[PDB]
Amino acid sequence: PDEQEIATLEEDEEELFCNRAKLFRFASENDLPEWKERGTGDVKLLKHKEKGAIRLLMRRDKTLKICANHYITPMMELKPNAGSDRAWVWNTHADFADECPKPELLAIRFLNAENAQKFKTKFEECRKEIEEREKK
Amino acid sequence: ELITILEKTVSPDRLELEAAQKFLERAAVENLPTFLVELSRVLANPGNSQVARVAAGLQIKNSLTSKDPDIKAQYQQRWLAIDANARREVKNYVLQTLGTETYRPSSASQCVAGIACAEIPVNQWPELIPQLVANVTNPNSTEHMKESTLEAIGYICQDIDPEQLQDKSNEILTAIIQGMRKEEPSNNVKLAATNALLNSLEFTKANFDKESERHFIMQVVCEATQCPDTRVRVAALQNLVKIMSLYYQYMETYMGPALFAITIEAMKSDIDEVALQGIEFWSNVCDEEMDLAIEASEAAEQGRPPEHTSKFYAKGALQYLVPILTQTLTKQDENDDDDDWNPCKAAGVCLMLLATCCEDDIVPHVLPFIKEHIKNPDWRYRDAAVMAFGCILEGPEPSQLKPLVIQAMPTLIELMKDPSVVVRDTAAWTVGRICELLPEAAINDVYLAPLLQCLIEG
Amino acid sequence: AAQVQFKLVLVGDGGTGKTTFVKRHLTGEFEKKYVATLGVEVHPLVFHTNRGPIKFNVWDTAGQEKFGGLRDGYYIQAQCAIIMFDVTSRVTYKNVPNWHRDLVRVCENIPIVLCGNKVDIKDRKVKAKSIVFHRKKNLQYYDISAKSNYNFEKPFLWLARKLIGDPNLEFVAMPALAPPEVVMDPALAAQYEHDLEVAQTTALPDEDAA
Ligand SMILES: Nc1nc2c(ncn2[C@@H]2O[C@H](COP(=O)(O)OP(=O)(O)O)[C@@H](O)[C@H]2O)c(=O)[nH]1
Ligand SMILES: [Mg+2]
C-alpha cells in the first residue's frame, strides 16, 4: 500500500507541555452561542527548533484526530475563567483543525486545580517568550 | 428519458439527489400506470447500465411494498386498480427480463415478488408459478435465469401469507430441492436455492408435517452441508439451525445418526464462518431446552405439559461438547479485540449456556481441563482455563462449588498479576463473577464485605 | 484517486441512532435535540490507519417510514453498512431482521455491523443475553453510546479491517499541518473580544451540566 512512513510532523519541534484534558468549542455561528464538546486528549504545546514559533495542537482519544490546531499570539492574554478554578478560555483567529482557517473560541478543563495552574503558567511563559521574540 | 435521472440517483451530491427524487415523485404522482410502464421498459432493455436497471427495479418494488402493513396493503389495493392491459404489459416485461441480469443480486426478482404478493391472493397471475417452475426445471435455462427465478421464488415464499400458496407449496419445494441437489454444477445456483429454502422454512410447516417430505428435506439439507463451497455450508448450517428452532419435536429421528457428526465437524473446522454456526447450533439447542424446562416447571402445577418433548440432547452431548469448547477457547491472539466476534466468544457463551442448562453435571467434564491448564506456561491455555472456570460458576449449586477457596482463589489472585494482559483481564472478569457468587457460598457474612472490597481493588 | 473511499450506509431505525453518531465523528459534539433526518444526508468521514488514509462516504438513511423518500434506492453499489438499534426500546431491535433483509436483497455479502446505541443511559431494556441476532447471521456486534464515547470508534475500525483486508490495522495519529498566520481589522478584534467575554460569562453553565 501507500503507507510509506507515517510522520506526525511533530519533529523539528520541542514539546514544552503535554497533559490530559477536555476541550470545548464555542458555537459562535449558531444562534445560541453556548458551548459544545470538541474531544478529550493530550494538549500539546510545540515550539519550533529554530523558527521560534509556539503552537497549540490537541488530538482526540482512541481516534487520534485533530480537534484544535492554531499558533499562539501575544494578543491571547487577558480573558480567564477566574470565576471557576477548573477552566480556561482563549480566542484564536486562525484555526486549522479542519484544514481551513476559522475563528474559534475554546475552553479547557484539565482535572481540578493543579494541572490548570501549571498549564496557565506554561502558557504565560510561552506567550512572554513570543512577545520578547516579536519585540525585536 | 428516465435513464438520466435514474443514473443521477447514485451521485453523492445533495442537489442531484434532491432533483432526482423530485422528478421521481412528480412522475409517480402524475400518471402511475405510464410511469410504471416506462420503468419496466427501462428495466427490460439489457442495453442500459446496471445502475439504471437496478434503480428502476427498486422504484417499481417501492411502488408496491412498505414496511408498515397498512401502507403495504394500500399499495397493493392501488396496484389492483390499475388498467388490466397496462398491468399485463408491465408483468410481461418484468417476467421476460429475468435471466438477462449479469449482476448477482437481481433487481427484477424483487419486482416479481411484489407483484406476486399483490396478485396471488386474488389469483390474478396464474401463470407465474408454472412459469417459474418451468424456468427452474428446464435443463436449457441459463445460470442467471435459474438464480433469478430461485431468488424470486424465495422472496415470494418469505413475503406472502403462508395460507395462500399451500396448494403449490409441493411444487415450490420440489423446484427448490432440485436447485439444491448435488447434480447442479453452478455454486451460485446452489447458494440461491439454499437461501430460498432458508427464507421459505416458515412457509413449509404443512410439508414438514408430512413424514416423507420432512425426511426428504432433512436428507437434502444434510447432503448440502457437505458442499465444497464455504458459503453453501454456512447457508446449510443456518438452515439446520432454523429447522432445529422451528421443528424441535421432529428432530428425534435425525439427531445422532446424521446431525451430531455434522455439527461436531463444523465446530472442529478451522473456518470461522463454519465454526460460528457449529457453536450456534448447540447454543440454540440449549436455549430451546431451557425454554422447555421452564415450560415443564410451569406445567408441574398444571399436571400435563402441552408440548414438552425435551429429549435433553444437550445433556447427552455434554461430554462431547465440553472438550471441543475448551479447545476452541485456546485459539486467541494478543492483538485481537476482546469484543471481536471470533469463535472464542461463541464458545464461551455456549459454555455458559451449558452450565446454566446441565447445572450440577457440568463440573466433572470441565474441572480436569482447569486443573491441567491453570498453570500452563502458554498464556493462551491459561486464559482458556480461567475463562472456563469463570463461565462454569453460574448454574451449579454453590455448595457443590465449595472447591474454589481451596485452590482457585490463591491461583487467580496470582493470575491477576500475570504479565499477559489478556489473562489478567479475564481473571478480573472471573473474580468479578466470584464477587457475586460469594454471598451465596459464604457460610456467614463475617468476611463478606472486607473480602469483597479487597477483590474489587485486586 | 489516491483515496480508498467506500460508500457506507447507515440504516438504523426511527430515531435513536444516526445523525448523532455520525455528527460525533464529523465535528465532535452531542446533539441533544431530535431533528428527524429528511433524506439521505451524506457526510464524508476521513480516518487515518497504518495502511494509509481511508475515507467513508457515509450515507445516512432516515429511519421514519414517511421520511424515507427513496427507501431502498440508496442501497445501490454499497460496499459496507451498519445496522443500528436502541437498547432502550425492544421495538427497534425487533426491526433489525427487516433491515438486514433489505440490505441483503440489494447488496451481495457486504460487511454489516450491528450496533446497540444508548448503553450509558442505564435501565437497559434489551439485556445483553437477549441479543442473539448477530449469532444467527454471523454479524459483528458492539455496544456503543455517543453520549459517553463508549466504543464509538469500534464499528469503523472493524469495517476498515474487513474492507482493507488487514486484521492488524489500527488507527494512527492524523498528521498535523502548520496553520497560516493572518491578521484582520481591529474592529473585528474588538467584536471578538466582546464575543470572548460573552463566552467567558457563559462557560460556567456548561460546567454545572458537566
Ligand atoms: N446516540 C445517543 N443518543 C442519545 C443518547 N441519549 C439520548 N439520545 C438522544 O436520542 C436522539 C436520537 O435521534 P437521532 O438518532 O438523531 O434520529 P435519527 O437520525 O432519525 O435516527 C438524539 O437526538 C439524542 O439527543 C445516547 O446515549 N446516545
Ligand atoms: Mg435519522
mmCIF file with all atom_site columns, C-alpha atoms in Angstrom, chain B residues 325-332 344 347-348 351 366 369-370 373-374 376 378-392 415 422-423 426-427 429-430:
data_model
loop_
_atom_site.group_PDB
_atom_site.id
_atom_site.type_symbol
_atom_site.label_atom_id
_atom_site.label_alt_id
_atom_site.label_comp_id
_atom_site.label_asym_id
_atom_site.label_entity_id
_atom_site.label_seq_id
_atom_site.pdbx_PDB_ins_code
_atom_site.Cartn_x
_atom_site.Cartn_y
_atom_site.Cartn_z
_atom_site.occupancy
_atom_site.B_iso_or_equiv
_atom_site.pdbx_formal_charge
_atom_site.auth_seq_id
_atom_site.auth_comp_id
_atom_site.auth_asym_id
_atom_site.auth_atom_id
_atom_site.pdbx_PDB_model_num
ATOM 1  C CA . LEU B 1 325 ? -15.421 -25.762 23.527 1.00 0.00 ? 325 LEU B CA 1
ATOM 2  C CA . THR B 1 326 ? -12.437 -25.786 25.888 1.00 0.00 ? 326 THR B CA 1
ATOM 3  C CA . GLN B 1 327 ? -10.099 -26.480 22.959 1.00 0.00 ? 327 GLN B CA 1
ATOM 4  C CA . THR B 1 328 ? -11.743 -23.676 20.958 1.00 0.00 ? 328 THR B CA 1
ATOM 5  C CA . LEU B 1 329 ? -11.214 -21.223 23.825 1.00 0.00 ? 329 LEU B CA 1
ATOM 6  C CA . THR B 1 330 ? -7.446  -21.594 23.303 1.00 0.00 ? 330 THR B CA 1
ATOM 7  C CA . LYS B 1 331 ? -7.483  -20.063 19.789 1.00 0.00 ? 331 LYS B CA 1
ATOM 8  C CA . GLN B 1 332 ? -6.796  -16.400 20.503 1.00 0.00 ? 332 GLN B CA 1
ATOM 9  C CA . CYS B 1 344 ? -13.741 -17.826 21.209 1.00 0.00 ? 344 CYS B CA 1
ATOM 10 C CA . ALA B 1 347 ? -17.521 -20.945 22.690 1.00 0.00 ? 347 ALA B CA 1
ATOM 11 C CA . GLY B 1 348 ? -17.595 -19.022 25.966 1.00 0.00 ? 348 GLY B CA 1
ATOM 12 C CA . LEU B 1 351 ? -20.143 -22.962 27.802 1.00 0.00 ? 351 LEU B CA 1
ATOM 13 C CA . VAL B 1 366 ? -14.733 -29.136 32.804 1.00 0.00 ? 366 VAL B CA 1
ATOM 14 C CA . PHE B 1 369 ? -9.203  -29.074 31.964 1.00 0.00 ? 369 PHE B CA 1
ATOM 15 C CA . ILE B 1 370 ? -8.981  -26.250 34.512 1.00 0.00 ? 370 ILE B CA 1
ATOM 16 C CA . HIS B 1 373 ? -4.167  -25.773 32.174 1.00 0.00 ? 373 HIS B CA 1
ATOM 17 C CA . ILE B 1 374 ? -4.407  -23.401 35.163 1.00 0.00 ? 374 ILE B CA 1
ATOM 18 C CA . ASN B 1 376 ? 0.246   -23.941 31.573 1.00 0.00 ? 376 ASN B CA 1
ATOM 19 C CA . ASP B 1 378 ? 1.403   -20.828 27.305 1.00 0.00 ? 378 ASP B CA 1
ATOM 20 C CA . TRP B 1 379 ? -0.709  -17.764 28.088 1.00 0.00 ? 379 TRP B CA 1
ATOM 21 C CA . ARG B 1 380 ? -3.460  -18.909 25.710 1.00 0.00 ? 380 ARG B CA 1
ATOM 22 C CA . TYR B 1 381 ? -4.171  -22.140 27.599 1.00 0.00 ? 381 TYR B CA 1
ATOM 23 C CA . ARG B 1 382 ? -4.060  -20.315 30.942 1.00 0.00 ? 382 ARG B CA 1
ATOM 24 C CA . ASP B 1 383 ? -6.550  -17.770 29.586 1.00 0.00 ? 383 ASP B CA 1
ATOM 25 C CA . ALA B 1 384 ? -8.791  -20.581 28.342 1.00 0.00 ? 384 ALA B CA 1
ATOM 26 C CA . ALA B 1 385 ? -8.672  -22.312 31.732 1.00 0.00 ? 385 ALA B CA 1
ATOM 27 C CA . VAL B 1 386 ? -9.506  -19.176 33.720 1.00 0.00 ? 386 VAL B CA 1
ATOM 28 C CA . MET B 1 387 ? -12.266 -18.247 31.256 1.00 0.00 ? 387 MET B CA 1
ATOM 29 C CA . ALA B 1 388 ? -13.816 -21.713 31.526 1.00 0.00 ? 388 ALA B CA 1
ATOM 30 C CA . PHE B 1 389 ? -13.622 -21.650 35.323 1.00 0.00 ? 389 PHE B CA 1
ATOM 31 C CA . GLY B 1 390 ? -15.341 -18.266 35.363 1.00 0.00 ? 390 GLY B CA 1
ATOM 32 C CA . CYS B 1 391 ? -18.010 -19.475 32.938 1.00 0.00 ? 391 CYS B CA 1
ATOM 33 C CA . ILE B 1 392 ? -18.906 -22.583 34.961 1.00 0.00 ? 392 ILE B CA 1
ATOM 34 C CA . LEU B 1 415 ? -3.183  -14.603 37.687 1.00 0.00 ? 415 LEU B CA 1
ATOM 35 C CA . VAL B 1 422 ? -5.460  -10.888 28.273 1.00 0.00 ? 422 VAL B CA 1
ATOM 36 C CA . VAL B 1 423 ? -5.285  -13.431 31.092 1.00 0.00 ? 423 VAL B CA 1
ATOM 37 C CA . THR B 1 426 ? -10.148 -12.485 32.061 1.00 0.00 ? 426 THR B CA 1
ATOM 38 C CA . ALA B 1 427 ? -9.086  -13.253 35.641 1.00 0.00 ? 427 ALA B CA 1
ATOM 39 C CA . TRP B 1 429 ? -13.795 -10.887 34.986 1.00 0.00 ? 429 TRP B CA 1
ATOM 40 C CA . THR B 1 430 ? -13.703 -14.267 36.750 1.00 0.00 ? 430 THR B CA 1
#
